[PDB]
Predict the 3D structure of the following.
Amino acid sequence: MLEYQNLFTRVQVRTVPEPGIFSYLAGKFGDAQIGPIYLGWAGVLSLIFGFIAIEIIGLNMWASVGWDPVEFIRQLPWLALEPPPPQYGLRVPPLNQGGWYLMAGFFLTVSIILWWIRIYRRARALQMGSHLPWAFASAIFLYSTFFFQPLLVGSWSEMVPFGIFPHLDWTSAFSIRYGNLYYNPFHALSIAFLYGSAVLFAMHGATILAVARMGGEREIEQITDRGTAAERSMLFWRWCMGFNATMESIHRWAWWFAVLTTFTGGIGILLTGTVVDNWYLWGVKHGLVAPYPAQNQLTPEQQDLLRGRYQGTAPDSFPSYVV
Amino acid sequence: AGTGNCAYCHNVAAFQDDTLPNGKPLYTKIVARRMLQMTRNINGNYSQHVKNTGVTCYTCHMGKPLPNGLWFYSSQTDYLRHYLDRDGARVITQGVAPSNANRSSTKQAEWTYALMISQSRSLGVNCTYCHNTRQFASWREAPPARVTAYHGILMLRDVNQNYLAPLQPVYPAVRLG
Amino acid sequence: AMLSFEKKYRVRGGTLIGGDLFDFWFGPFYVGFFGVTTIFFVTLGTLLCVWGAAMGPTWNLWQINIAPPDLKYGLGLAPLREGGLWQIITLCALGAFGSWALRQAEIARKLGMGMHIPWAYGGAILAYTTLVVIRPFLLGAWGHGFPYGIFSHLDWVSNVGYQYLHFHYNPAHMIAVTFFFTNCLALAMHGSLILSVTNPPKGTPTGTSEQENVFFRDLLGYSIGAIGIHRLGLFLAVGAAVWSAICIVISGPFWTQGWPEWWNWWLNLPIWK
Amino acid sequence: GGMTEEEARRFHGYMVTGTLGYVVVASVAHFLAWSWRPWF
Amino acid sequence: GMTEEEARRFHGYMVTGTLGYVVVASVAHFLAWSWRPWF
Amino acid sequence: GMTEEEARRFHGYMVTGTLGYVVVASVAHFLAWSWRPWF
Amino acid sequence: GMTEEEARRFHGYMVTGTLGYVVVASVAHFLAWSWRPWF
Amino acid sequence: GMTEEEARRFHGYMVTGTLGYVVVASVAHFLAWSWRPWF
Amino acid sequence: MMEYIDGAQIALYAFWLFFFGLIIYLRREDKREGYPLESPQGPRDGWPKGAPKKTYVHRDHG
Amino acid sequence: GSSYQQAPITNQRRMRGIMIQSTLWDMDRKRSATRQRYYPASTPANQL
Amino acid sequence: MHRIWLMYDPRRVMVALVGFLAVLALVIHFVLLSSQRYSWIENGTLGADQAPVGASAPAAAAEMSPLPPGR
Amino acid sequence: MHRIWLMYDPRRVMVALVGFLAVLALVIHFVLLSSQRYSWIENGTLGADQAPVGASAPAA
Amino acid sequence: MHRIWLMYDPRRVMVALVGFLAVLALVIHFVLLSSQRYSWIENGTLGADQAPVGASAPAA
Amino acid sequence: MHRIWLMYDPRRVMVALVGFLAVLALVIHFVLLSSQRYSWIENGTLGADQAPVGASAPAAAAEMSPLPPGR
Amino acid sequence: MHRIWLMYDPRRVMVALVGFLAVLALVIHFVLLSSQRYSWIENGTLGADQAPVGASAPAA
Ligand SMILES: CCCCCCCCCCCCCC(=O)OC[C@H](COP(=O)(O)OCC(O)COP(=O)(O)OC[C@@H](COC(=O)CCCCCCCCCCCCC)OC(=O)CCCCCCCCCCCCC)OC(=O)CCCCCCCCCCCCC
Ligand code: BCL
Ligand code: BCL
Ligand SMILES: CC[C@H]1c2cc3[nH]c4c(c3C)C(=O)[C@H](C(=O)OC)c4c3nc(cc4[nH]c(cc(n2)[C@@H]1C)c(C(C)=O)c4C)[C@@H](C)[C@@H]3CCC(=O)OC/C=C(\C)CCC[C@H](C)CCC[C@H](C)CCCC(C)C
Ligand SMILES: CC[C@H]1c2cc3[nH]c4c(c3C)C(=O)[C@H](C(=O)OC)c4c3nc(cc4[nH]c(cc(n2)[C@@H]1C)c(C(C)=O)c4C)[C@@H](C)[C@@H]3CCC(=O)OC/C=C(\C)CCC[C@H](C)CCC[C@H](C)CCCC(C)C
Ligand SMILES: *[C@H]1O[C@H](CO)[C@@H](O[C@@H]2O[C@@H](C)[C@H](O)[C@@H](O)[C@H]2O)[C@H](O)[C@@H]1O[C@H]1O[C@H](C(=O)O)[C@@H](O[C@H]2O[C@H](CO)[C@@H](O)[C@H](O)[C@H]2NC(C)=O)[C@H](OC(C)=O)[C@H]1OC(C)=O
Ligand SMILES: *[C@H]1O[C@H](CO)[C@@H](O[C@@H]2O[C@@H](C)[C@H](O)[C@@H](O)[C@H]2O)[C@H](O)[C@@H]1O[C@H]1O[C@H](C(=O)O)[C@@H](O[C@H]2O[C@H](CO)[C@@H](O)[C@H](O)[C@H]2NC(C)=O)[C@H](OC(C)=O)[C@H]1OC(C)=O
Ligand SMILES: COC(C)(C)C/C=C/C(C)=C/C=C/C(C=O)=C/C=C/C(C)=C/C=C/C=C(C)/C=C/C=C(\C)CC/C=C(C)/C=C/C=C(\C)C(=O)O
Ligand SMILES: COC(C)(C)C/C=C/C(C)=C/C=C/C(C=O)=C/C=C/C(C)=C/C=C/C=C(C)/C=C/C=C(\C)CC/C=C(C)/C=C/C=C(\C)C(=O)O
Ligand SMILES: COC(C)(C)C/C=C/C(C)=C/C=C/C(C)=C/C=C/C(C)=C/C=C\C=C(C)\C=C\C=C(C)\C=C\C=C(C)\C=C\CC(C)(C)OC
Ligand SMILES: CCCCCCCCCCCCO[C@@H]1O[C@H](CO)[C@@H](O[C@H]2O[C@H](CO)[C@@H](O)[C@H](O)[C@H]2O)[C@H](O)[C@H]1O
Ligand SMILES: [Fe+3]
């Protein structure tokens, strides 16, 4: 699309030899190799473990449509590799009843951890702060609660199924089971930071593009040697809303809002079914729930008649009614 | 059976007979006799569901021998068995803290959710017809239709267990699952 | 009070309306004509929210609930005690949000900046206007708007979702969620990269655009560049709100069944029907 | 980068015989299909 | 890229390899048809 | 790249390793067949 | 990179380690088969 | 990096630590076996 | 045996105390440029007081 | 249930996903896809 | 007609032609494979009279009154 | 016809061929395996007269 | 035919081969292990006379 | 045969090999641990005649139940 | 054998090894603690003759 700076409209340029003293260097910033996409030992291992995880998921999905490759594509978003049955709790389940699930979950988790090691080592080698590995750690924290919350309630059956629509079925059913997740205050906070991340990157993206013709996009120079582009960015927000960040500190606001999305998220999941089993009733207790006029009223006879039963096991027989 | 089609049920020379001249039973007449008892049982005992609208043969059959929505045994976890031999769909805890009273799985909430989509489609309504979805367990916040819906479950269990399912030996095999 | 470099920038000019009359500051804030109209709408709309709380059942902040009218009033103004007050507050909110964007355009003009910030904020205004004007208009009643209350609007979101049985299956909603999630990832990466070159381990020289370029290429396998990452953030953040506005405006006015059965077209493609 | 008219003449001869051979195989296939299970 | 001499030599292998593959597949179809005909 | 006699040397190993692999797989298949035929 | 003599030295260890590992696995399969045969 | 004599010096500790670890593990296993044998 | 106090409420105020501490920290970082403010009747620091202006050590190349 | 009896294999679903009956099979009635929903009949070779 | 290869680069056209034919051929086979009459993997050994035929028009008074299947 | 290899890089097209043939063969084997008649892993030991056949048109 | 190793770098071909053979071997074993007839971990000690076959029992 | 180490950097080969062997060994142990016949942690003390055979049925257990009692 | 430490920096191998062993030990302890037979925190004082055993085969 068209753009409000000339910079790459036309007369883009080719470094025919490498940049770093299009093309790329083959050399080192200190001891860090600069040419290929970095892996190291942890990157290589992460790809092997993660490949087998994805391969187990795909093969179980494909087996579930009876190996039919037409149905494998046609039905793909409905397919899943599913957690164990509830009766097993934390015991090892049968291979076709969640044993492959826990195996793929294990290999995926190791693959994620090894990818964090990779990023951590690469940040050190490039002589950079560890901000990015700890940002990624906050995402891993939320992910890990999909293991620890099932552990704390005592059943692998509560884990998230691997599958496009099936994991969204789980997301809805989790909120249904625990009495409406909107009344989980850490879910509410996690949304506040999720929305705030879109607010900040909209504001910051627009701000830097609004001064890009004055070099505002060269943020490292503007941080170390403040130009008029940084000054105008500070003054716009000060005049708009009464206060402002700096060119450096807006990236701290950005960092924390993103990080706090998954951090508060993880706490809300860990609290669910361990401390609070019905968040709406917790909302009533602590005064979150707005009153509405009653839509129906039960007699005492209906209060006993309309009590249900908690859901049990499926029938394992096909009864004849011959009589 | 279509108007004037007494031959669908009867040996039309001998309306009192429950068999053909060959001695083979007029299965359609034997079924229809049970369908009368079933219709009286619906209109009489399940007024909390059908009220003064009631049902007649036309409600299911609509001019045809086969009603819609016929179902048969398949999987154990088939949710339609809520209308036959199963009982209990509740999964929500009636208290703040976890307890031993409710140990329902998130898979059991998925099963209730599947069942409730079927009911919504069966009536062409959405969940808010019977619930305030801020708390699915609540009856006070739900419309009164939720109470009628519950009696519909109890009615179907009686209809299926006592009338439809025991007709198994009467039907020809082409009608069976 | 002023930043130690600020006074130099406080010139006249750049106003869209009103000339020099409102072209002045109040503390840190620039005023301008749309500053005046902002404070008018903010004050009126806020005081009517306080009145809505006063005539409601409680002062508890979480529980206050200023509901829209019944659907039977259609596109008319209800009695104020029956949702009409929600309608007046909605007109105040539209006036405030519009004034705020136009005031930002005056500020950007006065500093010689591009208009990017007003237009980005336009994406939020679009989503709001879709929720309370456009979708309720296409449905034929203002009562389809969401109530103004911190938790009572979450009850509205819940019930609107389940009006379509399984709102996760809404295709535009899946796109909007993907933008919101990818935006949060991109914000974490960009924030971390800038901070990690400007704040290296103790006793290490300050980093460079080359180091962040190299690290970003190791993360995504390509080099976005400094202008590109800000373009991408703006695209993701604003695109999220635009796809949000789409996903709600199609729900009801255009699609009325459950969202899962929308996917029937995919199952029926002739290559595999 | 180009194509001479003389080179095009040579290429076009192959292009025609390839197309014709393909059309012939497709024609035999359809008649096998038709005699197995006619669609009209 | 290739000289016409390379193209001439490559074509000889490429054609022979293609026809060898088709021959092997022909026996595979002969064996499959003998075991369970599809018409 | 590599020299043509160096490619000759490499090809001998590829052919040998392939033949070794095919031999092992042939014995594996025949064991499997004797254990539980699939036709 | 690596020299031919260095590659030859490495290959001796690499072959010997591979074959030693396969022997240990052969014994573990002997023990497993004796405890609970799978055919 | 290390010299080859430094690598030989390090290796003697590495072998010793590995042996010490295996010894402690073997005692731990024989205790576990005596408390509750798995075969 | 506390009826009203529960673990989720305890956690939430733990977060609030952290969060307001974070906002104080972020506003100190926001003030490393352009502060102290200028006004009549002299300089102004706002609240919280800003952290000092920050010098950055360049890489040598000689 | 006090104990579990296995269904015949032709009554066992290949797809373990819990909502699939409502979210897919309620609208999908392709014949080949319907057949794939259950495991096929399986018998010891003795009994053929 | 060979002048057409002066106007369009045969490197582009041969690739485009092969891609077009490959996709078309695949589409037609999968359409047929998903039909009932030409599901040839399952039913290819049926004779032409035995093969499925899609439903006709009612081809009658379109009003008829039924009789039960024999018990 | 060998001049076709002057138009197209033989290295690029030969890789494109092998990639195409591999995927095509895999699709065909899995189409067969998931059919009733050619589910040969489960039913390969059946004789040809015993193997499944899809439904005919309904008899008169 | 050793001149194909002039045409393609054996470093790339031999990696692509090993990758293809590893993935293919995993797929075939997973298919067999998911079958009834070759569920060999659970049933490998059954004789061929009583291993499962994908056919219905006789007499309807 | 040793010239394969001129062709590939052994520092990279050994990492990939160890990763491959680790993943393969872990897969096989978890496969066996999930089987009936070889669930050795629960049933390893059974004699070879007493160990399961058959039990290839896909649903050996009930899919749907409450969680075990939670004290 | 020692020349492996010229090929791989022992600073790194030792750290990788210690982490590998820690994760492996955690996995095995967790697998046992989750088991019925070896849930030693609850059942550790049971005698070997009293500890759970997985079901013997009816082979049905
Ligand atoms: C939930 C997750 C997401 C939630 C997301 C939440 C994000 C929150 C972002 C907003 C926070 C920053 C706001 C800010 O710094 O504004 C500048 C202003 C003044 O300081 P200054 O700018 O450095 O100096 C200028 C001033 O000294 C001289 O200026 P001048 O003479 O020209 O003008 C007059 C003065 C008069 O002061 C005021 O009028 C402001 C009084 C009200 C400030 C309330 C701030 C919000 C507190 C929120 C925390 C909590 C309060 C309970 O200065 C001004 O005119 C400045 C006008 C600034 C207007 C800012 C309005 C922001 C409203 C934010 C509403 C947020 C709603 C969520 O600062 C302050 O007054 C102090 C604020 C310090 C941060 C709050 C920390 C609270 C920690 C906990 C309690 C601490 C007790 C000691
Ligand atoms: C009916 C549905 C329920 C509901 C149920 C849930 C549930 C259940 C959860 C959330 C959660 C979240 N919900 Mg909610 N949610 C609802 C309504 C909403 C609404 C709304 C407008 O109505 C919004 C905006 C949100 C918003 C949010 C987010 C704030 C939060 C997720 C944070 C995040 O970044 O996650 C996205 C980020 C991640 C998942 C992190 C992933 C990181 C890992 C490391 C990535 C690994 C990738 C790997 C390498 C490769 C994978 C390969 C494949 C396996 C093949 N919800 C209603 C009430 N919501 C979560 C939460 O935190 O709750 C407190 C959560 O668990
Ligand atoms: C480079 C040499 C030529 C060649 C030269 C010959 C000669 C010469 C003869 C044949 C003959 C035959 N070839 Mg030729 N043939 C070639 C390529 C092929 C290809 C192919 C896929 O490219 C195929 C399917 C065939 C197939 C055939 C058969 C129809 C026939 C004998 C059986 C046979 O297959 O033996 C197995 C052979 C192959 C699979 C091909 C590869 C082996 C060599 C190149 C050919 C067999 C040589 C034969 C033993 C010579 C005997 C001569 C005596 C005087 C009798 N050839 C190559 C390109 N072929 C014979 C014939 O016409 O019989 C009626 C014959 O005399
Ligand atoms: C702060 C919270 C947000 C966040 C942050 C975040 N995520 C991150 C990071 C950060 C800061 C990273 O640095 C990290 C990253 O790498 O980013 C590019 C990551 C990441 N976030 C990811 C995803 C992700 N993040 C999400 C969300 C979020 N991330 C939050 C919104 C989501 C959502 C919303 O669901 C997802 C899906 C990944 C893209 C990435 C971590 C990648 C990773 O761990 O990969 C592990 C490896 C595999 C799964 C294996 C892949 C296998 C190949 C496909 C096989 C190819 C063959 C192979 C070569 C064979 C082997 C041969 C060997 C010899 C090599
Ligand atoms: C592009 C899409 C994203 C976006 C971007 C964005 N938002 C922006 C901007 C940008 C680029 C600004 O420049 C602008 C700004 O100045 O930020 C500091 C703004 C802004 N985004 C804001 C909020 C906000 N943005 C949100 C979302 C989004 N913002 C999107 C995700 C949300 C969500 C999802 O909930 C919120 C709450 C403000 C902080 C600010 C706009 C300030 C403004 O308009 O001020 C004038 C008006 C008032 C101060 C008060 C008006 C009071 C009313 C008259 C009465 C109340 C009516 C109201 C409807 C009641 C609702 C009650 C609730 C409980 C429902
Ligand atoms: C087949 O058996 C299963 C397992 O019992 C039945 O499912 C039960 O009921 C469901 C509500 C629930 O979902 C499920 O968890 C399970 O509890 C299924 O409905 C079929 O039921 C018939 O067979 C039952 C059986 O188990 O054999 C039988 O039960 C009664 O008889 C047996 C044998 O004497 C005895 O063990 C049971 O305790 C006994 N139970 C009761 C409640 O009487 C059913 O008979 C009756 C009257 O329930 C059968 O039901 C019918 C209508 O035939
Ligand atoms: C069908 O069969 C039932 C058999 O019960 C007949 O019912 C009889 O007549 C009813 C009026 C009465 O209520 C009932 O108790 C019973 O007495 C019914 O009428 C139909 O009858 C025809 O088929 C009969 C059948 O069973 O095959 C046949 O009955 C006669 O022949 C059988 C042997 O084939 C013998 O067992 C019966 O006892 C015998 N009955 C008599 C009364 O002769 C009927 O034939 C005759 C003559 O009645 C059939 O009726 C006709 C008109 O074809
Ligand atoms: C469920 O069932 C479904 C899936 C449905 C059914 C369908 C299945 C399908 C479609 C299958 C298709 C299979 C297939 C297709 O082609 C299979 C193809 C198989 C092939 C080709 C195997 C080839 C193996 C070759 C090997 C192992 C070679 C080893 C070489 C070695 C060891 C030597 C290395 C070099 C050395 C040592 C020294 C060099 C010298 C140097 C460097 C010097 O000197 O410098
Ligand atoms: C799903 O299945 C499930 C259920 C999980 C089951 C299956 C499990 C499986 C598959 C397990 C596999 C296990 C395994 C595979 O190999 C396990 C392999 C284990 C190994 C190799 C352990 C090795 C340990 C070695 C140690 C501890 C060494 C310590 C050394 C020390 C202390 C000395 C350091 C040097 C010093 C101090 C000198 C400095 C001098 C210097 C510098 C100088 O002098 O210069
Ligand atoms: C031939 O190759 C093929 C064609 C098969 C390759 C193709 C594959 C395809 C098409 C794959 C498709 C994959 C898709 C679509 C995947 C979708 C995945 C989604 C959407 C997943 C969403 C959420 C999943 C979550 C949150 C899972 C979390 C699991 C966790 C945290 C599990 C942890 C397990 C641990 C830590 C340990 C387990 C082991 C035990 C319990 C024993 O502890 C030691
Ligand atoms: C070597 C570790 C193997 C672990 C597996 C179990 C032990 C099996 C082998 C034990 C015997 C020693 O094994 C043998 O060691 C010698 C050196 O000592 C290696 O010898 C290798 O390096 C030496 C120089 O150091 C060269 O001269 C020789 O040509 C080369 O093969 C052999 O490659 C290996 O076969
Ligand atoms: Fe930036």
